[PDB]
Write a structure and sequence with these properties.
Blueprint: E1 2-5, E2 8-14, E3 17-24, E4 32-41, E5 44-48, H1 54-67, E6 72-77, H2 82-85, H3 88-93, E7 97-101, H4 102-111, E8 118-120, E9 139-142, E10 154-157, E11 162-164, H5 188-198, E12 204-206, H6 216-226
Parallel strand pairs: 5-6, 6-7, 7-8, 11-12
Antiparallel strand pairs: 1-2, 2-3, 3-4, 4-5, 9-10, 10-11
Helix pairs in contact: 5-6
Bound molecules: 1,5-diphenyl-N-(1H-tetrazol-5-yl)-1H-pyrazole-3-carboxamide (N1G) and zinc ion (ZN) (2 copies).
One zinc ion binds at residues 34, 83, 167, 208-209.
PDB class: hydrolase/inhibitor
Keywords: Carbapenemase, inhibitor, complex, HYDROLASE-INHIBITOR complex
Assembly: monomeric
């Protein structure tokens, strides 16, 4: 059910949830898909992650205008790397309130990202402090611990079977953990497992660089991360 819209792809995952996909291409390597989410929550829309670029992110908003035609109340971005935060300026130009882990906003300038406008903080159990995530509706934001990066966060969608691992989680047949240049090799495995335990009823696991998968994505990612120690 892939819907092509310019250079982006949208796939409906639930009556009110879509995966957005955008592409970046470099020499010597194939084009890399990056996935985020779009959620219709009643009379408003919520976005998880930008596309790689401002232009692509503006196209996400154009697709939302054409197919949903409701205001985008907020966006949450899941770590301070280009695939998740490269299009922040497009969100801000559109007047959308933006949220990220406080640590992502701390890292953003050095990483070459524009910071989100608002910082999330997290309790010791990993769940976002609700006072820092006003009006998040069905988005349930969880910091699983350091893994792909020190700041990576994850998001479940209440009322659905969906949980989003961002770049932390790879699919059940993945042959690598991707870019580990910023990774926490000691804690990756526990963080992957903590994500699974935070959303134990989610049967559809969505992630940055593979199509949606079963919970075997979580077990397989953790088993690969076991070898990093
Ligand atoms: O973030 C990444 N990867 C990941 N995420 N989670 N685990 N690994 C990731 C990937 C890539 C990439 C994009 C196209 C071809 C090859 C590589 N660039 C990238 C971005 C800008 C310039 C050069 C590379 N960044
Ligand atoms: Zn990353
Ligand atoms: Zn990534």
């Amino acid at each position: 059910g892939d819907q092509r819209f310019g250079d982006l792809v949208f796939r409906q995952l639930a009556p009110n949830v879509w995966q957005h996909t955008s592409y970046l291409d470099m020499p010597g390597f194939g084009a890399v898909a990056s996935n985020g989410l779009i959620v219709r929550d009643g009379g408003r829309v919520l976005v998880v992650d930008t596309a790689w670029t401002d232009d692509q992110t503006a196209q996400i908003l154009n697709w939302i205008k054409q197919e949903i035609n409701l205001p985008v109340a907020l966006a949450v971005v899941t770590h301070a790397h280009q695939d998740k935060m490269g299009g922040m300026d497009a969100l801000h130009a559109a007047g959308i309130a933006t949220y990220a882990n406080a640590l992502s906003n701390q890292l953003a300038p050095q990483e070459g990202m524009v910071a989100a406008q608002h910082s999330l903080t997290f309790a010791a159990n990993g769940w976002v402090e609700p006072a820092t995530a006003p009006n998040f509706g069905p988005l349930k934001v969880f910091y699983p611990g350091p893994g792909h990066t020190s700041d990576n966060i994850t998001v479940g969608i209440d009322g659905t079977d969906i949980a989003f691992g961002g770049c932390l989680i790879k699919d059940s047949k993945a042959k690598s953990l991707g870019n580990l240049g910023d990774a926490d090799t000691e804690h990756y495995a526990a963080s992957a497992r903590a994500f699974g335990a935070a959303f134990p009823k989610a049967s559809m696991i969505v992630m940055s660089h593979s199509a949606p998968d079963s919970r075997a994505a979580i077990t397989h990612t953790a088993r690969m991360a076991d070898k990093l120690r």
